[PDB]
Design a protein around this ligand. Sequence first.
Ligand code: FAD
Ligand code: NY8
Ligand code: NY8
Ligand code: NY8
Ligand code: CL
Ligand code: CL
Ligand code: CL
Ligand code: CL
Ligand code: CL
Lengths: 134, 667
Amino acid sequence: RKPPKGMFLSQEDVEAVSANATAATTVLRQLDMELVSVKRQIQNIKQTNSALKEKLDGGIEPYRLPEVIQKCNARWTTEEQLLAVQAIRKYGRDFQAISDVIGNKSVVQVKNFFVNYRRRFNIDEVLQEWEAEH
Amino acid sequence: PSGVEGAAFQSRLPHDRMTSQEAACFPDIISGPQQTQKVFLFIRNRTLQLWLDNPKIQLTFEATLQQLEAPYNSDTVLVHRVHSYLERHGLINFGIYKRIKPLPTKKTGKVIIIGSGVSGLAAARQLQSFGMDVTLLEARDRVGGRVATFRKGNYVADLGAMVVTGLGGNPMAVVSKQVNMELAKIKQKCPLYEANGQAVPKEKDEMVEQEFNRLLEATSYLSHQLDFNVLNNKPVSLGQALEVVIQLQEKHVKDEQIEHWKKIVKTQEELKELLNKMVNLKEKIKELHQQYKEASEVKPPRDITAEFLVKSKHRDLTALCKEYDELAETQGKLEEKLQELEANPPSDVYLSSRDRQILDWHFANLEFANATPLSTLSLKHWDQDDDFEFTGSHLTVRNGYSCVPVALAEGLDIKLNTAVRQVRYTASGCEVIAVNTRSTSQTFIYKCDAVLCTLPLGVLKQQPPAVQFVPPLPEWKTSAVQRMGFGNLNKVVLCFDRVFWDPSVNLFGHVGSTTASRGELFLFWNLYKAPILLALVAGEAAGIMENISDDVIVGRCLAILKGIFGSSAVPQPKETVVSRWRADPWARGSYSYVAAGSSGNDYDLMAQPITPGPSIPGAPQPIPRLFFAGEHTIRNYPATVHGALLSGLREAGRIADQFLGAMYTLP
Ligand SMILES: Cc1cc2nc3c(=O)[nH]c(=O)nc-3n(C[C@H](O)[C@H](O)[C@H](O)COP(=O)(O)OP(=O)(O)OC[C@H]3O[C@@H](n4cnc5c(N)ncnc54)[C@H](O)[C@@H]3O)c2cc1C
Ligand SMILES: COc1cc2nc(NCCCN(C)C)nc(NC3CCN(Cc4ccc5ccccc5c4)CC3)c2cc1OC
Ligand SMILES: COc1cc2nc(NCCCN(C)C)nc(NC3CCN(Cc4ccc5ccccc5c4)CC3)c2cc1OC
Ligand SMILES: COc1cc2nc(NCCCN(C)C)nc(NC3CCN(Cc4ccc5ccccc5c4)CC3)c2cc1OC
Ligand SMILES: [Cl-]
Ligand SMILES: [Cl-]
Ligand SMILES: [Cl-]
Ligand SMILES: [Cl-]
Ligand SMILES: [Cl-]
């Protein structure tokens, strides 16, 4: 039932290497060709990838800014409320962004904010404007 | 096995079942009740045992009955029928025994046996054993045929058969008990040595041996599981099948390499897509950083849209900086997958050149044993007789294998230098016409009831015919002769001044530069404790080599050897001989093989006797006249000395049944 382990002998394969005096030579040059293609196509992408790596050279170290390490707070200052309305205008529902921008608020506090102030900061309206843009 | 059960095995019989021959001689028993079957078997195995325990003297029916113990002792007709079957058919009182019962003074029937080989000799000696009158005609000036020993001073070397292929079940065991053969076990360690003379190293020797083995298993798979036995209109050779198998290993090596290099591109394409994302992202970062720098120019305290703007850009830039750090983690991974894959390729090629040459030697070794190019062997059937192997180790005949035919010829009417030319068989009997080999117009005529033909299959195949049959052999027989193969295999005997090689080792190989010359002096044998080396020419080499001078051949021999043991260590040889079996016109090759196109069924066809039509029209069916023996007529034991011997035994039984009658087959 079983060929020796690691010998490969498909029905389909056999009919191919036999059905002409040189069909072996066909099949084996054709794979040899395709092998060269694929080894060239590797050469292309190596050269491309190496050029792209030259463009990244330096990383992004010159551009990173230190981060706002800041404890949350029960109290909304007027500053904080005004930041928030503006973040809403820029970021729609993305609450995590909004908490980054404000920097003394958790994502929960933010979410409650949408609810408390909904009426007074016409938050509906604000969102309608962010939607109408994106 | 052993006991009585061993005697069966040692006679190539199943200790616990009745054979076809037994059935046909003992229908009453085998269609009988099973208990009588056990009795039969016992008596058989027991008589076999008595003969085997002592085959230097005739085992008579009385001696047999004497030594059976009742209830088996009781039925004396059975014991008689059984003893007679065995005797007739050559299972007991074969070979060279002291006769107890004396020979019928008056003889019955006359047989002419063509050829004094082992088959011939063995039949002769049985028929005379039985009271027929027998004469052998032999073309050569000596008896043993293709058992052909070289002898000069104390040098002794077989050019013919050389090896006893193991004693377990081999009638030659009986023969060595009877003759003095000095048998000698052969050390199976075989060292190889590439074209230059460097020992192959144990690493490669084994890689390649295993691969040889896998490649054969593979043909077998190809044959049985895939039915790959006809291709176009023709039958497939073992050689073709091996090509195909190797071509597909070459293909799968490429296929592997392809899928690996495809893993590399697909990985490179991902790295590219990612390095693109990363280059765009550094751009948006750069821009945002400037923007932040700018918005930060507005100094505090400032209105809240300005504050928003600083804080918002800051956020955005750290969000993208984070995103880029993720992407450059991924990048370091993707670059690892790639140092991994570039370091772990699949194998480069299926076989190196040193590998494919070393494998060629394994193929030469096989061409050697089948005495023919692998391209001629039947894929389905080349190995059809391998089930019939004996047991124990291959041996050689220290005093020369000739000692056997020579022994067998004692007492026997042999005409040497008598080449048969025509064989005439008719309803009334036969006439054989021969000539003197020396003076080839001196002409002889032998009249007989029956001819046994043991002419070699080579000789039967010769165009135009060395021997004419009158009437001609029927198509059924001639087509079998055409389809069977008759190969070739040669030896070079190097007789030396002093032993210069590892005597711990009987044999060693030489690897051939090309595939085309894989057979050419591919192997060397040293005769046990004696200063002689033989070198073998096999496959396609054998034929070609025949047509090249002896000094050249001994040339190439000395060279190869100098390359291994160094130019200082290798003398000129005292004597040399070179076999040429295909040119030998009494042989026309070495031995038969199952050519592609044939089966073992052809060996049986080869053994069937011929029965001439009636002389007067509408007179009844004669009896058969022309019988056949020799190596090419025994399906289970072709191309050996034991099988030649068995074929003769067989025919002698067939002829005696036919001309003396077989009393023992009657209830
Ligand atoms: C190189 C080689 C190595 C071998 N090695 C082994 C081995 O190691 N082990 C093994 O078991 N077997 C081996 N054999 C095979 C063995 O020699 C044969 O199978 C056996 O000897 C054949 O016996 P035979 O009686 O059928 O044929 P043969 O011995 O060939 O007998 C037939 C006789 O016919 C004679 N003859 C031919 N034409 C005519 C004619 N026109 N008129 C009268 N006589 C004629 C011949 O001269 C010959 O004497 C080997 C054979 C060869 C060639
Ligand atoms: C299916 O697996 C295998 C089967 C094999 N079967 C045979 N049969 C040989 C007798 C052929 N019969 C058709 C006459 N030989 C193998 N090959 C060998 C046998 C041992 N010989 C040593 C030898 C070599 C040559 C001999 C010549 C005459 C007498 C005895 C000889 C002994 C080398 C070839 C072999 C190998 C196989 O796989 C590794
Ligand atoms: C399918 O599986 C098989 C694999 C097999 N593989 C080998 N390799 C033999 C070399 C190893 N040997 C030294 C222990 N031989 C098989 N068989 C041997 C048995 C006896 N030898 C003896 C022999 C050897 C050489 C002969 C040359 C001419 C005529 C007859 C010959 C007979 C032949 C090969 C065999 C058999 C198999 O199944 C039946
Ligand atoms: C390394 O070398 C060898 C490898 C070997 N590998 C096998 N296995 C093949 C299973 C398939 N089948 C054809 C039996 N058998 C070997 N041989 C034996 C297996 C048991 N059979 C038993 C047997 C013995 C005598 C027989 C007589 C008539 C009909 C069948 C018979 C079967 C004989 C061959 C053998 C031998 C080798 O010897 C050198
Ligand atoms: Cl001769
Ligand atoms: Cl000789
Ligand atoms: Cl090959
Ligand atoms: Cl401020
Ligand atoms: Cl006829």
